[PDB]
Amino acid sequence: SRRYDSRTTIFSPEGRLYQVEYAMEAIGHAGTCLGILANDGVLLAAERRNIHKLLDEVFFSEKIYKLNEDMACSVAGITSDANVLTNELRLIAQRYLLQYQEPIPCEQLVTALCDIKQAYTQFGGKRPFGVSLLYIGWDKHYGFQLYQSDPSGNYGGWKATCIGNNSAAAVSMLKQDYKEGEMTLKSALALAIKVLNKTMDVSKLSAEKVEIATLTRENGKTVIRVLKQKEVEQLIKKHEEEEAKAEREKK
Amino acid sequence: VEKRITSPLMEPSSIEKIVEIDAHIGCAMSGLIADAKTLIDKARVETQNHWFTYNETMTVESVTQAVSNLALQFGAMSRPFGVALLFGG
Amino acid sequence: AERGYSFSLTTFSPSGKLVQIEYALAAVAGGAPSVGIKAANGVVLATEKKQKSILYDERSVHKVEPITKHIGLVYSGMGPDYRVLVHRARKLAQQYYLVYQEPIPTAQLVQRVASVMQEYTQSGGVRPFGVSLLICGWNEGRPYLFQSDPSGAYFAWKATAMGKNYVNGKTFLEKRYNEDLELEDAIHTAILTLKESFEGQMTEDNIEVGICNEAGFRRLTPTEVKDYLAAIA
Amino acid sequence: AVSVYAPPVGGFSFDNCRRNAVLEADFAKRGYKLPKVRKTGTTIAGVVYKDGIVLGADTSKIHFISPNIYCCGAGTAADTDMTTQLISSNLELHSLSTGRLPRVVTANRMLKQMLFRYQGYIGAALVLGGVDVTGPHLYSIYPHGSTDKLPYVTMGSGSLAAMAVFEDKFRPDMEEEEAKNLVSEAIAAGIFSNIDLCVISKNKEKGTTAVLTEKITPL
Amino acid sequence: NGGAVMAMKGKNCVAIAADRRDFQKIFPMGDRLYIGLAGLATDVQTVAQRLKFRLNLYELKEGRQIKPYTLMSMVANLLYEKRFGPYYTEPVIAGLDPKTFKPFICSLDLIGCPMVTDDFVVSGTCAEQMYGMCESLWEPNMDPDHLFETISQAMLNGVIVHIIEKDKITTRTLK
Amino acid sequence: YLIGIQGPDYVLVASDDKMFKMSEKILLLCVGEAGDTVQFAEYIQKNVQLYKMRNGYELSPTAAANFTRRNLADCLRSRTPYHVNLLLAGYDEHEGPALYYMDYLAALAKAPFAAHFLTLSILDRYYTPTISRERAVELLRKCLEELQKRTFSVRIIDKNGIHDLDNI
Amino acid sequence: LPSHPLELSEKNFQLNQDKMNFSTLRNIQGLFAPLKLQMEFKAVQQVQRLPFLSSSNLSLDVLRGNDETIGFEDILNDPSQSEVMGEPHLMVEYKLGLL
Amino acid sequence: SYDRAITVFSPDGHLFQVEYAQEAVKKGSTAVGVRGRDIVVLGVEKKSVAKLQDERTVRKICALDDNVCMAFAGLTADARIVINRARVECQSHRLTVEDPVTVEYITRYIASLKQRYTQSNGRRPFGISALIVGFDFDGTPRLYQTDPSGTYHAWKANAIGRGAKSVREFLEKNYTDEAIETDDLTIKLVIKALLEVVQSGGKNIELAVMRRDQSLKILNPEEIEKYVAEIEKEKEEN
Amino acid sequence: MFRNQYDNDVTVWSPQGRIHQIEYAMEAVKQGSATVGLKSKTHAVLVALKRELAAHQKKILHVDNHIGISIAGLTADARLLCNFMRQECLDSRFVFDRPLPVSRLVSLIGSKTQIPTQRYGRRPYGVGLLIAGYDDMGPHIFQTCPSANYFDCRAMSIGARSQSARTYLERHMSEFMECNLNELVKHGLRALRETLPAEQDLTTKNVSIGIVGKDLEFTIYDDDDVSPFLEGLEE
């Protein structure tokens, strides 16, 4: 409150660091990004928010990134910082793989990047990154996983999560329509698209507003892929038809 | 020293204010005990190197002078040391 | 007001805004108009150079400069920061070429320069480079166009505008630009965009055009841009 | 993760050197069979004449430094390619800053300084020849960083015969076809093979095969 | 410090064959791209591991696959990093181009020195005579089976022949 | 004399003790310079304990072998007089038993059977993946007899865990 | 002793370069020029990324005059892609001089 | 006031930044430590279980050496950093002395790290206080505490974080010796302390058990539910 | 009034072209205790007036064999300056095998104390040093104002109530030159007593004397050792 926010290294009478809280507010200003754990795999239903009519598509994905053979993540925050943070993720994963010749367990990479972010928070003269990354992946230990770190480095485990815009509503509605141990990747995508429909009120899902990823295990290989425009269009159409049928049933 | 035990569950052994820096040297702490840790550690190190090299006993004045030389460094510490010692040897 | 946050670069505003980067982008927006159009045969980097005085020598600082044989760029904002970043871009391109014996992809060079700018946008003691880079190039038989910002964030574009009346420039590009649009008339489109965002009379020495096609980047001579202007009007 | 404090740096790593030397001492007396270095032991030649420079490399050993600067290579191969590539990139950056073609003196200075910094531990015995604003120059780089700007220079396997040919058959300010025939004669003496005359003109038994482990991986 | 391996070219198919008795020399540096490290076992393993580290970083950042020429350049840079105190390795790089699927074969130095041919390249302690034998045996144009026999006989004059055919690669340890 | 015999669900080492365990299911057998060998064993044991208790799970025998190869290469690289040969017997929950031959130059190699030549020749003469514990003990005894003609205390790393077997 | 004659030659190449530059300037220009250059280098180095990330050091090279020059240290081993990395807080403490 | 710099003092003689780090510690959830005979327990408040959350990923109780662990209250990331550094230090000490660390030793190291980070304005003090417990080695159960100020104190029963006063007063009333006569008694004591702290039990208790020759054993929710049901039966009896 | 902006930092000039931090350090030395220094043809004498139960402070210090000092300001900066002086003298006698000249040492201290005034993140040494010594060219009594600039003095005094001592020394500035060691010391004691209130008279436990002479090397005199001089000292 106009005090103890000049630096990141200064506390308040209540024992609060306002700079990281403002970084989280900046996250809140970002675009909606979902992550839902499922039995078959795990998905990342992000909001493309690339709706200019003179914008190119020369990249793999805007929201969705790939860290290693076993991991992928989404981004909701400051793009410039998120780029270096994802580069650091890739580098850390490759360091661990080079040293041990085994893919980095998801929690270890998440914790390493959280250490990076909280180190930038710890020391004076450095701005907290202000990026929330939505990690997914598979490992021998805990199978499929869903993690979510914040600018301050606080990371938690999740079955379904959201970061960015309308995150609180998205999470509440996910836990309202989520089953633990029952959701398959199919129903996971259905729930993700439903949440995106009911959260992104700026416009209806046109299949370019939406960027959904998928991470499954075929032949003991982590298959990280992104739903084709056809796939997301089918998801949107299925959700809209089911909603219309429910409205008809309500009468 | 009047060691202050905050609660009955506290161990008085851990809150000791009087310490040993050498067999022939002793001091009592009062104030920021955390910085007193560094101060008395420096004094212990100095007397230990003295015993190692000259195989004698550091004068109380000499060990307190060394730990003062540690304490002179502020503005190492970035603020004046917030603890006082009574080097009784 | 939120002035404490306005002054400091390493602080987040209560709403979560980096005001210093916003002011760097305002400096970018207060720069000279620059229009880049990604055509089918190649790309165009046209801008409104500020050397309109007869004294200003032509063989001097160029708004459009090459980094490699197949990459060039134009800027809007601070000339000095632009030139320093151009030097860094050339250094990075040579590093990549010596490591891989391969032409640096435009995307990779944009990434490297954007990270360099993010480096100064992150830490306290310096300022964000008050300049945005409209980097173009050509790889694997494909035209490229990118836009870097002082924040260090960069985006791919089909047709974008910078400087003054840059929102109007982008609206004009959206009005005119076509996906099939070929080169040698995308230059005409860029000329018309800069005319829509011009101040004065359009002269071959009031603009600086650089195109990059399969052959590579090439800053157009006054004669060529004069011919294009004559064809336009 | 632990036991790493200083930040990373770049440059040559000389860590392998000590163990490498001890192991060579071990292999020298028992085991042998250590990989060696492929080297440019072939002859190179170069002359300066009226309207440019001409270089010869029987092998090619000629290396593009700039559009108007070229450089032959003798000594060690990897060393000479890396050196020429680095100086070529440096001169490319210099030209980009200038908007002018780089000068041969700049190339000679860069090569000399870098090779002296490396104290001739990388074998780059080069014949730097090109044309610039000043005019055609023919330097002679050495691994230890010594240069001679002579009318003609040679180095390599049969470089002495090439030098004799140059000395006997050279006249001041030769012409295009005369210069490139003198270098060819000198480089031909080194051979005694096709030569890459680089004219930088100023104006311009059925064994038993029994498969054991057959596997496929459709792609 | 033993170990030898060679490569041969064909028609949309390229072969790389090493010997066995006791370490890996054929590391897949790509889906249709392999490496031919030959020399001291520990050095081979270290070079392969760090090369794969660099390759994975490059693939993640670029979004494309390393091409054989780019892989050769990367290997040369890696070996030249330790120019003083050289790695006891002579990588032989064979494989198809991920985009155009064109055969490529090359051999490198202990410090890195690109050497590209289109018939065959050999590395190892007895590489010179093996290459002479290949010359005595080599022919211009091969099919995947004919290419396999040629490299196999040359190595023998077991052999793990990895014929990299764009349709599919085949591996066979002969004798 | 550090003879190892990998089996279907165990790895019977036979030290001459040299059996310095790193963590549960991991057993490293170090031979060479007396001072360097034990120091390296202690260092790797501390590192694997740190990994175990920081991540909540231990390094697998393969991961431990790779990390040890890296560290041994570095140690030889930092100081030449570090002649240290290793033999990492271990059991993986998923992979299963894992024996790892590694020379002083840190050239890791998974071994169906290993020794640190006479002992290896007997193993070469007779070995089978489908072997029993008593069969491996007999193999070790034969290898020791051949080496004597030219101790052998044995442990196994079984799915149950490390076990102490009758000294040979 | 070192692992190679060039080991220390290139471990401290930059140190010697600056040392000789300042020696020459002191001998010719005077005390002021080395002082000024040291001040500029110190000021530019005070502001950069934390040691566990890869700093660009752009403006430092611009002052030094090697922002448009390439060397073997630029290409051979890349600090941006490191193979072993320490803890963040640990290396920041090391840089501050606490350890 | 003088609360905008860790370096500056106040005419009272206070460094308000460190006291604010302590306030942040107080913000954290409750952690309860009891030092019994052949047993040490770290009860933690698990009130905010939430939904679609993994209790495995986020825990307060973490091990530092084979014979010592800790539980904290405050900034989770700061505690994570301190825990990792403490593990590194413990393994280094075992490397160089060949014997397991003492609880006092790692408490000393953690307090020294907090003292290091409270030295200067540039570094803010770690905003977590650790209840470090375990066995020295010869078999002496230990309980300790740390604070951002950077000093440590051994304890017999201590509670930190949220509602620390009420829980530590409950321990003052009920610690005694008859409540540490058995490990089950210590578990019941910490569970009752957290019942005085947090409303619910079992599902709101993240309890850990560490016996004389046993490693950190984080009790499962069913076991803690059984223990709190035993407490409820005892209450019904009286 | 308007000097608050420019009186907190030592590297900022005020609109009146003044650095008030240096003046505040010169006030700090003034707030310290009064000490006296004076020399004869053959001797350089320092007399210091010390601060109840518990021992007093060591205003007089033996910094070197033939150099001695008296402190009249902050104790910490005084200790650092004494350490630096002792190190300089030790290095001179070790390498050059020369008793370090007192004037040279004073110039070194002047530069040392000048450093912080022009540097940020530092404060001027808030201590005044009366440096006695003897070598080559007879005795040397000096004064290092906490502002780097220093002065050479036949007699001097610095501290709180030191103006009376200065006036008395001026009254007999010329007499000290033609005085025996004893008489010089008594003159110093009278100068000190000028600083004491009229009621108080010099005792043995509130006086330390530092004396370096032609044959004599610097020595600090305690209560018992200063009693001789106090015995005979005219009221």
Swiss-Prot record, chain B:
The modification Phosphothreonine is found at residue 6. This is Proteasome subunit alpha type-5. The keyword Glycoprotein applies. Induction: Up-regulated in colon cancer cell lines. Up-regulated in fetal Down syndrome (DS) brain (at protein level). May be the target of the transcriptional activator NFE2L2. Component of the 20S core proteasome complex involved in the proteolytic degradation of most intracellular proteins. This complex plays numerous essential roles within the cell by associating with different regulatory particles. Associated with two 19S regulatory particles, forms the 26S proteasome and thus participates in the ATP-dependent degradation of ubiquitinated proteins. Expressed in fetal brain (at protein level). GO terms for cellular component: cytoplasm; cytosol; extracellular exosome; extracellular region; ficolin-1-rich granule lumen; nucleoplasm; nucleus; proteasome complex. It comes from the Eukaryota. GO terms for biological process: proteasome-mediated ubiquitin-dependent protein catabolic process. Belongs to the peptidase T1A family. The keyword Cytoplasm applies. It is found in: Cytoplasm; Nucleus. Keywords: Acetylation, Cytoplasm, Glycoprotein, Nucleus, Phosphoprotein, Proteasome.
Swiss-Prot record, chain D:
It catalyses: Cleavage of peptide bonds with very broad specificity. It is an enzyme of class 3 (hydrolase). One of its GO terms (molecular function) is threonine-type endopeptidase activity. Transmembrane segments: none annotated. It is found in: Cytoplasm; Nucleus. Its main location: cytoplasm. Coiled coil: none annotated. GO terms for cellular component: cilium; cytoplasm; cytosol; extracellular region; ficolin-1-rich granule lumen; nuclear body; nucleoplasm; nucleus. Its EC number is 3.4.25.1. Keywords: Cytoplasm, Host-virus interaction, Hydrolase, Nucleus, Protease, Proteasome, Threonine protease, Zymogen. Residues 1-41 form a propeptide. Expressed at a low level in colonic mucosa. Up-regulated in colorectal cancer tissues. Gene3D superfamilies: Glutamine Phosphoribosylpyrophosphate, subunit 1, domain 1. Pfam families: Pr_beta_C, Proteasome. InterPro entries: Ntn_hydrolases_N, Pept_T1A_subB, Proteasome_bsu_C, Proteasome_bsu_CS, Proteasome_sua/b, Proteasome_suB-type. Belongs to the peptidase T1B family. Component of the 20S core proteasome complex involved in the proteolytic degradation of most intracellular proteins. This complex plays numerous essential roles within the cell by associating with different regulatory particles. Associated with two 19S regulatory particles, forms the 26S proteasome and thus participates in the ATP-dependent degradation of ubiquitinated proteins. This is Proteasome subunit beta type-7. It comes from Homo sapiens.
Swiss-Prot record, chain F:
One of its GO terms (biological process) is proteasome-mediated ubiquitin-dependent protein catabolic process. Induction: Up-regulated in ovarian cancer cell lines. Keywords: Acetylation, Cytoplasm, Host-virus interaction, Nucleus, Proteasome. It is found in: Cytoplasm; Nucleus. One of its GO terms (cellular component) is extracellular exosome. Pfam families: Proteasome (PF00227). Non-catalytic component of the 20S core proteasome complex involved in the proteolytic degradation of most intracellular proteins. This complex plays numerous essential roles within the cell by associating with different regulatory particles. Associated with two 19S regulatory particles, forms the 26S proteasome and thus participates in the ATP-dependent degradation of ubiquitinated proteins. Belongs to the peptidase T1B family. The 26S proteasome consists of a 20S proteasome core and two 19S regulatory subunits. The 20S proteasome core is a barrel-shaped complex made of 28 subunits that are arranged in four stacked rings. The two outer rings are each formed by seven alpha subunits, and the two inner rings are formed by seven beta subunits. The proteolytic activity is exerted by three beta-subunits PSMB5, PSMB6 and PSMB7. (Microbial infection) Interacts with HIV-1 protein Tat. This is Proteasome subunit beta type-2. It comes from Homo sapiens (Human). The lineage of its organism: Eukaryota, Metazoa, Chordata, Craniata, Vertebrata.
From Swiss-Prot, chain H:
Keywords: Acetylation, Cytoplasm, Glycoprotein, Host-virus interaction, Nucleus, Phosphoprotein, Proteasome. The modification N6-acetyllysine is found at residue 226. PROSITE patterns: PROTEASOME_ALPHA_1, PROTEASOME_ALPHA_2. It is found in: Cytoplasm; Nucleus. The modification Phosphotyrosine is found at residue 152. One of its GO terms (cellular component) is nucleus. Its main location: cytoplasm. It comes from the Eukaryota. Glycans are attached at residue 129. Phosphorylation by ABL1 or ABL2 leads to an inhibition of proteasomal activity and cell cycle transition blocks. GO terms for molecular function: identical protein binding. Component of the 20S core proteasome complex involved in the proteolytic degradation of most intracellular proteins. This complex plays numerous essential roles within the cell by associating with different regulatory particles. Associated with two 19S regulatory particles, forms the 26S proteasome and thus participates in the ATP-dependent degradation of ubiquitinated proteins. PANTHER family: PROTEASOME SUBUNIT ALPHA/BETA (PTHR11599). Belongs to the peptidase T1A family. This is Proteasome subunit alpha type-7.
